[PDB]
């Protein structure tokens, strides 16, 4: 029927003076644009069809052509920035926003989807969608007593589009738009659908990827406990964004980090730091590194939860990127920790894996490790035990690696190496 039309037949139907012929041709275009492989988006654009589709969005009297054109334009907008731009340049934004209030749920949903692609292109189209007034009607679609009465796919599409209104930086979304969206986001974060939860967590992770004021906007809404709970979820698509959001939050102030600790987050890190998914391990170790950069009482919470042995484990064996994050966590720990906490660190076995990582080619991890060693030696000086630590390093082959690093081409590297040798190995 409307299957496998040529673009020229589509054009001929759309240019007819017959609304029903236009509808059939538009459905044919929709079917071309929704096929598995290589939708002919550029051919459709070049045929000049976008303004026709946009005009069809306004035909309240023929809801089927509204739907077909909305779907066609959705899929054009799903392509490259230039293809999305063609949709925007056709005037689609206000027309889709007008369709959000449609009495036909499938049409409103299609408009939600299209606005999600447009806003998802980037900060500029995101903010232009916002300026056209999309947030109010989008949120009105979610103003129901119980989200469970909404169709599952409908709610997932709304959540994803809102997450695109929260996404991207340079600039980040307008502060007032974030404040407007956040309560609905908090509500979606307690919904029981795994995809809604995943995308709500992604939105929160975007909103916390910024300066402390943005983090504070999120933390003030009281979502950290729910984020920790979701951090313990079994579905990896939920754990990943929840953990990203938590890590972002602990890049903030020590009080914000403390809200992560108070919510129980550390109790999850034995599993996270041994998680079989490499990216979970990496992100959890980065999170830890930004917790050990905090206050001594927070370092002490890391100690109490038994997480130093897990950091020793990741330093001993993990993907190299995770090992680099672990080195960072250790240097932060040693820079901020009390003497007793650093002693504890040594008693957990940090020295040998720390030394074994000095044979790595990455310059920055070498610097990080040498810093950590210096800090530990400083604690040993305060205890008068530099000799015992020197013996430790010598027995595991670390002295050979440092003395070798004296010949390292990097400046700060061979400087710190020389200082360690002449100061503690003479």
């Amino acid at each position: 029927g409307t299957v496998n039309w040529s673009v020229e037949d589509i054009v001929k139907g759309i240019n007819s003076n017959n609304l029903e012929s236009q509808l059939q041709a538009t459905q044919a275009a929709r079917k071309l644009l929704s096929r598995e492989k290589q939708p002919p988006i550029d051919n459709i654009i070049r045929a000049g069809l976008i303004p026709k589709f946009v005009s069809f969005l306004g035909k309240t009297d023929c809801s089927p052509i509204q739907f077909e054109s909305a779907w066609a334009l959705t899929n054009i907008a799903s392509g490259t920035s230039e293809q999305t731009k063609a949709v925007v340049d056709g005037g689609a934004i206000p027309a889709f926003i007008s369709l959000l209030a449609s009495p036909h749920a499938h049409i409103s949903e299609q408009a939600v989807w299209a606005l999600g692609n447009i806003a998802g292109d980037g900060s500029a189209f995101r903010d232009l969608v916002i300026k056209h007034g999309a947030i109010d009607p989008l949120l009105a679609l979610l103003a129901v007593p119980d989200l469970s009465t909404l169709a599952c796919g409908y709610l997932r599409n709304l959540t994803w589009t809102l997450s695109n209104l929260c996404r991207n930086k340079n600039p980040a979304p307008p502060l007032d738009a974030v404040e407007q969206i956040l309560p609905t986001l908090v509500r979606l974060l307690h919904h029981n659908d795994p995809e809604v939860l995943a995308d709500s967590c992604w939105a929160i992770s975007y909103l916390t990827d910024g300066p402390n004021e943005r983090i504070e906007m999120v933390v003030k809404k009281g979502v950290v406990p729910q984020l920790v709970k979701l951090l313990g979820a079994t579905e990896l698509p939920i754990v990943t964004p929840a953990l990203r959001a938590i890590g972002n939050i602990v890049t903030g102030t020590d009080e914000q980090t403390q809200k992560v600790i108070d919510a129980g987050a550390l109790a999850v890190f034995p599993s996270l730091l041994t998680n079989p998914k490499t990216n979970i391990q990496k992100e959890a170790t980065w999170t830890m590194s930004n917790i050990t950069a905090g206050r001594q009482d927070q370092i002490q919470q890391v100690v109490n939860h038994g997480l130093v042995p897990f950091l020793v484990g990741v330093l001993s064996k993990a993907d190299f990127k995770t090992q680099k994050e672990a080195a960072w966590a250790i240097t932060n720990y040693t820079s901020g920790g009390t003497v007793e906490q650093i002693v504890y660190l040594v008693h957990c076995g940090i020295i040998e894996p720390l030394m074994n990582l000095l044979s790595a080619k990455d310059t920055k991890i070498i610097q990080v490790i040498l810093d950590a060693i210096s800090n530990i030696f400083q604690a040993a000086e305060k205890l008068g035990e530099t000799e015992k630590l020197s013996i430790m390093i010598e027995e595991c082959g670390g002295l050979d690696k440092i003395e070798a690093l004296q010949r390292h081409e990097n400046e700060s590297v061979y400087k710190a190496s020389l200082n360690l040798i002449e100061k503690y190995f003479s």
Binding site: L33, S34, R35, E36, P39, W71, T74, N75, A77, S78, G79, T84, Q110, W113, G116, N117, G120, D121, W160, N164, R167, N168
Partner: peptide
């Protein structure tokens, strides 16, 4: 992951 989705 990509921000856009095509309806298939």
């Amino acid at each position: 992951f990509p921000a856009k989705k095509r309806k298939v």
